[PDB]
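User: I'm writing a short report section on ligand binding and want a predicted complex to refer to. Could you take this sequence and chlorophyll A and write out the structure as C-alpha cells? A short remark afterwards would be nice.
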Amino acid sequence: KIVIDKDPVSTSFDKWAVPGHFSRTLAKGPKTTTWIWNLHADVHDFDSYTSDLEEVSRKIFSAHFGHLAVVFIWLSGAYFHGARFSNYEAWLSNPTTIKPSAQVVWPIVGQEILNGDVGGGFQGIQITSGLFQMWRASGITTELQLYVTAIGALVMAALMLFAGWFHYHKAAPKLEWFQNAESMMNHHLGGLFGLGSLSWAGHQIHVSLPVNKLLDSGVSPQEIPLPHEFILNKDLIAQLYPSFGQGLTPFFTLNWNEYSDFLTFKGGLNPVTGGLWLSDSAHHHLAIAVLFIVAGHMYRTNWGIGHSMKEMYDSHKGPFTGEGHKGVYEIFTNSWHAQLSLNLALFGSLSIIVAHHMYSMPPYPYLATDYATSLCLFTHHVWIGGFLIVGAGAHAAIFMVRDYDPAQNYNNLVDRVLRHRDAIISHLNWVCIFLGFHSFGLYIHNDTMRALGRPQDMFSDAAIQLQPVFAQWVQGVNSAAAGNTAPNALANASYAFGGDIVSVGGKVAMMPISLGTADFLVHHIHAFTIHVTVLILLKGVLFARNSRLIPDKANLGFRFPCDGPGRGGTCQVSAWDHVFLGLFWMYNSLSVVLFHFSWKMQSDVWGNVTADGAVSHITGNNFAQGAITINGWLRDFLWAQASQVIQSYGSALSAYGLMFLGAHFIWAFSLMFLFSGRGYWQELIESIVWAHNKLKFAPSIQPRALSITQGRAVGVAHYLLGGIATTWSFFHARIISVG
Amino acid sequence: DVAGLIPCSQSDAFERRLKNTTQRLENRLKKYEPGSAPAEALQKQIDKTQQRFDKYRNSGLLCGADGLPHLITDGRWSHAGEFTIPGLLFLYIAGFIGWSGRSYLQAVAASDNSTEKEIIIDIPVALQSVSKGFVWPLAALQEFSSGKLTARDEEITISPR
Amino acid sequence: NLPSILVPMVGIVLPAIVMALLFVYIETDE
Amino acid sequence: FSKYLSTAPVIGTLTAFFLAGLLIEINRFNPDLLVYP
Amino acid sequence: AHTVKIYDTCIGCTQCVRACPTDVLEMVPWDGCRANQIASAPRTEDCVGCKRCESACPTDFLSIRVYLGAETTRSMGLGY
Amino acid sequence: IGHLSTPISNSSAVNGLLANLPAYRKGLTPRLRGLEIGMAHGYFLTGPFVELGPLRNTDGGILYGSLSAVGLVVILTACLALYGKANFSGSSKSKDATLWESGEGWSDFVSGWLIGGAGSVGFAYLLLQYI
Amino acid sequence: MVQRGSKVRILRKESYWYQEIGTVASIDQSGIKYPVIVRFEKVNYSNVNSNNFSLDEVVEVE
Amino acid sequence: TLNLNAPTPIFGGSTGGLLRKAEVEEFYSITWTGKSETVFELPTGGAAIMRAGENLLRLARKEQCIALGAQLKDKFKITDYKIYRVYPSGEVQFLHPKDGVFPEKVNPGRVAVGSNKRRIGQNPDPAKLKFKGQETFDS
Ligand code: CLA
Ligand code: CLA
Ligand code: CLA
Ligand SMILES: CC1=C(/C=C/C(C)=C/C=C/C(C)=C/C=C/C=C(C)/C=C/C=C(C)/C=C/C2=C(C)CCCC2(C)C)C(C)(C)CCC1
Ligand SMILES: CC1=C(/C=C/C(C)=C/C=C/C(C)=C\C=C\C=C(C)\C=C\C=C(C)\C=C\C2=C(C)CCCC2(C)C)C(C)(C)CCC1
Ligand SMILES: CC1=C(C/C=C(\C)CCC[C@H](C)CCC[C@H](C)CCCC(C)C)C(=O)c2ccccc2C1=O
Ligand code: SF4
Ligand code: SF4
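Assistant: Sure. The C-alpha cells for the complex follow:
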C-alpha cells in the first residue's frame, strides 16, 4: 500500500534566512558563541526537535537522496578528470610501465613540480584510486566513454536532488510506507541487489569480456571494435568464445554447459594481467543475481505467501533465553537508530572484508602489479570500515537512551543482556588484559631478550616458537581444494594460501603468504586491540541508561560531559564519551593492521622476479626476525620506510612530505584540546574580552570557550585527521617510490 | 656587506643555484617530444627560474655561504624593501580590517537586536564601515584625542580581587 | 664479588621487606 | 536568497574566495616577490 | 561528607532542591519576612557532590555552594 | 530477587566441586587445608620454570627451575602473612566465622602452605631429575 | 532612590555584570533583602539576564 | 515502618545489584504501591513488573532509590514511594520524606541547616583564617 501526502512543506527561502529555524531553542538567536557550535551539532539529528516519527522519517528519506546526489557529483569528477586530465589512453597501451595519473596541477608558485614524469607524454599526479584498472575491467577504451559517464553522473545527481525535493516538499510518504520492512527487504534483494548484479553481468558478458580478450591478445586499444559493435556484428562476437552463434537457445532449453567458455569456473588469476578472470566474474554475478532475486521472493506482502519477520522472532526462543527475539521487530520498525547501528555494523565489517578479499584475489587487470594502488585500496576500506563500526556502537547507544522502552522489552533478548552486563564486561575486561599481556608482552620479552644478548630466550622461529597451526591448517585445506572439494575449479580460491607465483612483467602479482611466529604475534595484537574497541563501545551501549554510579544516566541524555566532580568524579560517564574513547582505540586497532599489511606484503609477498624464476622482494623478508620486537617495528619499518616521505622535497612526492609534517602538526594540535579543559580557556577569554571592551568594540555575541563535550570532539577530530593523514602520507610516498 | 654577506650578483654560490636547477629540468626535458604539451610546460618552468634569479640579482639582496637571499631587519633605508616598506603596507590593510569591524560592532550594538546582526551582515552598515576603515590612521587619532577610543576601568567588567 | 651479594639484597630482598613494612603500617588502625 | 547571502558562513567564504583569488592572480602575473624593489 | 552551604541570596525557586539526586536539600520557612523560603542542607551526610543543585540555581553567582570535603562510602557513590 | 537465575547456575555438578575443595571443606582445620592447597600449587608451579627458564639445556635446568619454584612459595608465604596481618587486625569477627571471614587459625594456614608448597616443589623435583 | 526602568551600574564584585550597565525591571515594595531586579543585555554563563541586587550595589548612572 | 517482608516484584535477574556491602553495612529499601501491573526500568537493569502491593525493592545506594523514585512519579504518577535504611546492619529508618512532605514543598517545623548569613563575596580570606580551627565558608 502507498499513501502519500501532497505538499506538506512549501519551497521558500524564508527559513534559509533564519539559522536554527527547526527547534524552539535555536530559533531565538545567539546570546553566546556556543549557539554557533550548538547550531551545527544537531541539525541532522532530526529525532531531537521533531517528535513526530512520521516527520523524522521523511527528513531521513530526502536526506539520503541528497547524499546520493553528492556521490554522483563525486562520481562525475572521478570520470571527468579521467577523461580530460589523465593519461588513460596511453595507459591502456602500457599498463605496467605507465603509472596511473590524473589531476593536472596549475602552473602557479611551484606546485607544478607535482606534475611529475609519470609516463608517456603526460605530467600529473600519479593516482592510487584504482580507477584506471576499474575502467579497463569495465571495458572503457576511449575518453569519449569517460565523458558521457561524467555527464550521466551529473544528470543522476540532479535526478537524486530532484527526488529529494519532491519526496519532502511535494509528495511525502506517510509513516506506514516506511514501516513496510518486508516489502523493502523483498525489493532491495531482488531489484537493487539481484538485478544490479544481473545487469552488470549483462555488461560483463557483452562489453567487458569482448574487449578484454582482445586486450590480453594485445592488438591495440584503438584496433579493438566498439562495445556496441559486439551486439550488432554477431559474427564478431562469435570469433571469441564461439558460443554466441547459438544465441539464448542454450539458456531456455537448459543446456547451460554450452556457455562454458565465457561463463567459467577457472578460479584464479590471469597470467597476462594478474587479475581475476572476467569470465569468472561474469559467471559470479549471474549466480549472485539468481541467489538475490529469489531472496527477494521470501518475505510476505499483500499477496498471501511468504515469511513474516515478526513471526520468525516469535517462536525463535529457547529455555536459556526466556522470551527470545519477541519484541525485536517492534524495535527495528520503530527505532531509526537501532536500524542505523546494525546497518553501520555490517557495512563497516563488509568494508574490511572487501579490503581483505581484494589484495589476495585482485579483481581488476594490472591491479596487483601496481603496488602503489593495492596497498592504498586496502588501507582505505579498512579505515572507512572501522569508522562505521564505531558508528555502530555510537547509534546503538542512542537507541538505549531515547528509543528503548522497558514495557516492550520485558524478558526478551535485549533485557537479558541488560541483566548480565557486568558478566559481559568483566569477562571482556579479563580477555583484554589476558590478550594484552600474552601478545604485547611477547614483544616486551623480545625487546628485552634481544637487548640482554639472549636471542635464544625470545619468541621467534630460531627461538621458542609460537607457530600458527590453526591458520596453517586452514592454509592447507583452502590451498588443496582445486579438484578435491571444489572439483570444477581449475585452480584455488587465491594464491595466498598456497600455489605458484604469478608474475606480470617483472613483479609479483600474487604469491603464497607464509605464516610464522611473527604472524602469530601480530594476529593476537589485532585480536587484542579489536577486543578493547568492543570493550569501550559495549560498555557505552550497555551502561547508556544507568549504572551503579549514575542510575539516571538516561535522564541526562546520550551526550553530556559529566555529572560533576562528586562520587569521586564522574567525568566521561556518558554513552557519547565511550564513542569518543573508542575512536582512538579504533585508530590504535586499525593502524597496526595496516602496518602489518604494509610490511608483510613488502617483505614476504611483493617484489621483482628474475628471468630464472627467483624472487627478490622489496625489503628483503625482514618481517620474520624484525617484527617480533618493538625496536624492529621502529628501526626496520617506521624509520627505514619513511626515508622516501622525508627525502621527497624537490620532487613530485613533495606534497606527501608536506602532508607528512602537516599531519604531525594537527595531531599534536589535538592534544591542546584533549589534555586541557574548558575552564582554563574561559578565563583566558575573560581577559581578551577585557581588551576588546577596553577599546570599546566587544561583540554582543559573547565569546565563550568550547564545551567539554565539544572540546573532546575537536580533539578527537584533529587526532584522527592528524593521525590518519600521517599514515596516508607515509604509505603513499613509500609505495609510489618502491612499487 | 653588513654581516659578511656578499651581494647576490657577486655570489658564486647563487649562480650555482641557477646551474643545477635548469640542469634538473633540461634533463627532465630530454625524455619528452620537443613539440609536446609537457615540453612547453617545462620550458615555461625554466623561464620562471630565469625570471626568478635575474630579479634577485638586480634587487640588491644579500647572499651568504649557501647562496640564498637574506633580509636585514635593523631597518636601514638601503634595505627598506625587505621589512620596512612591506611593514607599512601590512599595517594599513590590517588596520583597515580592524577599524571596520570595530566600527561595525559599535553601529550594530545601538540597535534593536544586535545579536542577529553578527549572523546577518547589513551590507549598508558594512559598506559604511569600510568607508570608515580607509581613513583609520586619521580617524583613530581624533577618536583617541576626544577620549572615545577607550573606556575607563570602572566601566569594564572585572573579576573579583 | 660483593656486587653479586648486594644487588639481589636491595634489588629483591630489601624492597620485599620495606613493602612488607609499609603495607602493615597502612592497614593498621586504632 | 539575497538575505541568505548576508549570513556569516556564505559571506565569509566568498570573500575568503575573493581574498584568496586576489593573491592567486597577483602571484600569477607578478611571481617571486620577496622584497619591495 | 561534603559540606553544602546556603547563602542569603536565595530566592526560594526550589530548583536546587529538585535537582539533588539523593534528597540532601529541602525548603524551610524564612524568618526574614515569614513569607518566602530558603534552601537548606539537613542531610549532607548523603551528599555525593554531583553539584546538580548549583547548576539549577538561577541567581547570578550561586546561593547554594558545595565545597567537596572528606570522602566516605556514601560520598564516593559506591554500591560496594 | 537479587541474584540472577541462569539454567547453569546452582548446578550440583559445579557446586559439588566447591564444597569438596580444601577451601570450603567442612572437616578441615587451617593446618590441614593449607597443607592441601600448598601441595597442589607447589606441584605445578615447578612446571613453567624447568622448561621455560634462562637456563634450560644445562646440568642444571631441573634443579635451578625447582629452586625458583620454592622461591615463589616463600614469597607467597610472605604475602599470605602480609594479607593475614592486614585483613585480620585482631582477627576481626564477622557473621559467618570461617577461616577466611575471621582468621582465628591463620598462622597455621600460612605455615601449612609453606610445608606443602616447598615439599611438593621438592617432590616434583624428584619426579623430573629422577624417577 | 532607584525607580523601575532606570539604568544602574552594579557594585557587587562577585557578579558577572560587575561595573556594567543594566536596567531595572522592578523594585519589590517590601522589606525583602536584595529587592532590586535588574535586567541586562548580556547573558552570564547560566544564560540568565536577571538578578536581584540591593540598593547599595546599584547606582544612578543616567 | 519498613513492612518487611513485602513481595519483591516479579523480576529474576540483575548481576548488577546488592552485593557484599549490603550484608556488612547500609543497604537501602524503597516501598511504594503500584496501582497497575506495568513494567518499569530498574536502576540495575530494566524490567521487573510492579505488583498491586505493597511493593518493595532492596537497592544498594540512596542515589538509586531516588532515581527509581523519580521514575515512579514521572512515568506512572505514583508519588507514594517510601525509601528506608535498615536495622541492625543499617543506620536510620525513614529517609524520605523526612517531614512527611516532599522536600520541594515548604513545611513549617523544619529548621535551616547549613545556612550562611552573607553572600560568597563577603566570605573572608583564607589568610585571615590561617592556623585556626575556623573554616572559610562556615558561619
Ligand atoms: C532548491 C530549492 C529548495 C528550497 C528553496 C528549499 C527550502 C527548504 N527546505 Mg528543502 N529540499 C530541497 C530543495 C529546496 N528546499 C532539496 C534539493 C532536498 C533534498 C536534499 C530538500 C530536502 C529537505 C529536507 C529533509 C528538509 C528541507 C527543509 C527546507 C526548509 C528549511 C531548510 C533551510 O532553511 O536550510 C537551508 C540549508 C542549506 C542552505 C544547506 C544545504 C545543504 C545541502 C543540501 C548539502 C550541503 C553538503 C555539501 C556537500 C557541503 C559539505 C561540505 C563541503 C565543504 C564539501 C526550506 C523551506 C527542512 C524543512 O522543511 O523543515 C521543516 C527539512 O527538514 N528540505
Ligand atoms: C566512505 C566513502 C568511500 C569512498 C570515497 C570510496 C572510494 C572508492 N571505492 Mg569504496 N567502498 C566503501 C566506501 C568508500 N569507497 C565502503 C564502505 C564499501 C563496502 C560496501 C566500499 C566497497 C567498495 C568495493 C567493492 C569497491 C570499492 C572501490 C572504490 C574506489 C573506486 C571508486 C568507484 O566508483 O568504484 C565503484 C565500485 C565498484 C566498481 C564495486 C562495487 C561492488 C560492490 C560489491 C557493490 C555493493 C553495493 C551495495 C549497495 C553495498 C552493500 C550493501 C550491503 C551491506 C547490504 C574508490 C577508491 C572499487 C575499487 O576498489 O576500485 C579499484 C571497488 O571495486 N569500494
Ligand atoms: C602506550 C600507551 C598505553 C598503554 C601501555 C595502555 C594500556 C592499557 N590500556 Mg590504555 N589508553 C591509552 C594508551 C595506553 N594504554 C590512551 C592514549 C587512551 C586514550 C584514548 C587509552 C584509553 C584506554 C581505554 C578506554 C581502555 C584502555 C585500556 C588499557 C589496558 C588494556 C588491557 C591490557 O593490555 O593489560 C595488560 C597491560 C599491558 C599490555 C601493558 C604493558 C605491560 C607489560 C607488557 C608488562 C609489565 C612489565 C612489568 C611486570 C612491569 C612492572 C615492573 C615493576 C613493578 C618492577 C592497558 C593497561 C582498557 C582497559 O583498562 O581494559 C581492561 C580500556 O578499556 N586504555
Ligand atoms: C585438564 C583439566 C582439568 C585438570 C587440571 C588440573 C586441576 C590439574 C591440576 C592438578 C594438580 C595441581 C595436581 C596436584 C598434585 C599434587 C601432588 C602430586 C602433591 C604431592 C606432594 C607430595 C607427595 C609432597 C610431600 C611432602 C611434603 C608435603 C612435605 C614433606 C616431604 C614431602 C616432599 C614428601 C580439570 C579437572 C580442571 C577439568 C578438565 C580439564
Ligand atoms: C621601527 C622598526 C622597528 C621597531 C619597532 C618597534 C620597537 C616598535 C615598538 C612598538 C610599540 C612598543 C608599540 C606600542 C603600542 C602600544 C599601544 C598602547 C598600542 C595600542 C594600539 C591600539 C589602541 C590599537 C587600536 C586599533 C587600531 C589603531 C586600528 C585597528 C583596530 C585597533 C583597535 C586594533 C624594527 C626594529 C622591528 C624594524 C625596523 C623598523
Ligand atoms: C584551545 C581550546 C579552547 C579555545 C578555542 C576556541 C574558543 C575555538 C575558537 C577558535 C575559532 C577558530 C574562532 C573562529 C572565529 C571566527 C569564526 C573566524 C571567522 C573568520 C572568517 C574570515 C571565516 C576551548 O574552548 C576548549 C574547551 C574545552 C577543552 C579544550 C579547549 C581548548 O583546547
Ligand atoms: S539556592 Fe538557588 S536553587 Fe536553591 S532556592 Fe536559592 S536560588 Fe533557588
Ligand atoms: S552536590 Fe549534588 S547531592 Fe549534594 S546537595 Fe548538591 S545536588 Fe544534591
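A remark for your report: The first helix of chain H runs from residue 21 to 24. Chains H and D do not touch (no CB pair under 8 Å).
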